Amino acid sequence: QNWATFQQKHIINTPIINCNTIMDNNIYIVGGQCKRVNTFIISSATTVKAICTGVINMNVLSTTRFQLNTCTRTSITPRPCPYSSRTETNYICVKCENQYPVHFAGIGRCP
């Protein structure tokens, strides 16, 4: 991956109720129709860069709360995929390469 394209990876800081117009790009689609969970994170990419600071390859997890903005593919009002936006505490597991979060490990619970 890269720091610029990853800038979108964790920092899709869009305070609007339109998760499609913000993710309108070939970098946000799977092999079917739309993604089941377009989880975005609302926070400065550098604060996330501090929690992933350790070595040139590791696994860390934001235990405090990096406030996430998740648009989950639910149902009703298909356009064609309906999304329910909900913001809350972000306890997630990030991965660090080159010391910057180059990959997302997934949810908070990590090994």
XYZ file of C-alpha atoms in Angstrom:
111
model
C 0.000 0.000 0.000
C 1.082 3.669 0.372
C 0.657 6.643 2.821
C -1.487 8.734 0.342
C -3.962 5.975 -0.676
C -3.870 4.869 3.001
C -4.741 8.507 3.927
C -8.161 7.486 2.585
C -7.815 3.994 4.218
C -8.186 5.417 7.798
C -9.010 9.122 7.127
C -12.300 9.267 5.140
C -13.281 12.225 7.389
C -16.600 13.123 5.707
C -19.233 14.615 8.136
C -22.048 14.055 5.544
C -24.814 11.377 5.461
C -23.722 10.124 1.985
C -21.300 7.145 2.328
C -21.470 6.395 -1.474
C -20.538 9.876 -2.815
C -17.577 9.937 -0.363
C -16.384 6.377 -1.231
C -17.183 6.894 -4.977
C -13.958 5.200 -6.230
C -12.649 1.849 -7.572
C -10.663 1.516 -4.271
C -13.937 0.774 -2.340
C -15.642 -2.235 -4.105
C -15.600 -6.062 -3.798
C -16.532 -8.790 -6.394
C -20.374 -8.778 -6.184
C -21.985 -5.286 -6.093
C -20.963 -3.238 -3.022
C -18.977 -3.841 0.216
C -20.818 -5.294 3.256
C -19.090 -2.805 5.627
C -17.492 0.487 4.484
C -15.906 1.251 7.878
C -14.257 4.707 7.872
C -12.282 6.328 10.768
C -12.756 10.033 11.674
C -9.419 11.222 13.142
C -6.078 12.835 12.110
C -3.975 10.225 10.199
C -1.017 11.321 12.402
C -2.741 10.432 15.748
C -3.304 6.952 14.283
C 0.367 7.082 13.145
C 1.378 7.446 16.849
C -0.510 4.303 18.053
C 1.189 2.288 15.236
C 4.737 3.468 16.203
C 6.978 0.530 17.272
C 9.120 -1.078 14.499
C 9.077 -1.666 10.640
C 6.447 -4.497 11.086
C 4.123 -4.990 14.121
C 0.503 -5.214 15.370
C -0.992 -2.565 17.735
C -4.592 -1.671 18.746
C -6.185 1.744 19.531
C -7.477 0.796 23.034
C -8.524 4.352 24.036
C -10.958 5.505 21.248
C -10.138 6.865 17.737
C -13.897 7.698 17.032
C -15.005 5.688 13.922
C -17.659 6.550 11.280
C -19.045 3.176 10.029
C -21.481 2.928 7.106
C -22.745 -0.698 7.190
C -24.677 -2.251 4.249
C -28.036 -3.002 5.975
C -31.313 -2.988 3.909
C -34.360 -0.926 2.788
C -33.848 2.118 0.496
C -31.377 0.326 -1.879
C -29.427 2.856 -4.019
C -28.699 0.096 -4.812
C -26.920 -0.698 -1.479
C -28.418 1.069 1.630
C -25.955 2.199 4.365
C -26.613 3.028 8.043
C -24.048 5.562 9.352
C -23.224 5.385 13.094
C -20.322 7.079 14.960
C -18.939 5.892 18.341
C -15.770 4.869 20.284
C -13.155 3.287 17.951
C -11.334 0.402 19.677
C -9.683 -1.155 16.598
C -6.550 -3.170 15.679
C -4.163 -1.464 13.208
C -0.975 -2.915 11.644
C 2.380 -1.025 11.269
C 4.919 -1.325 8.403
C 7.602 1.375 7.809
C 6.227 2.542 11.263
C 3.059 4.040 9.623
C -0.231 2.069 9.758
C 0.214 0.518 6.288
C -2.483 -2.159 6.789
C -5.611 -2.574 8.970
C -5.551 -5.744 11.160
C -9.360 -5.497 11.605
C -11.575 -4.992 14.706
C -10.080 -4.087 18.125
C -9.760 -7.674 19.503
C -6.284 -8.746 18.261
C -3.790 -11.559 19.177
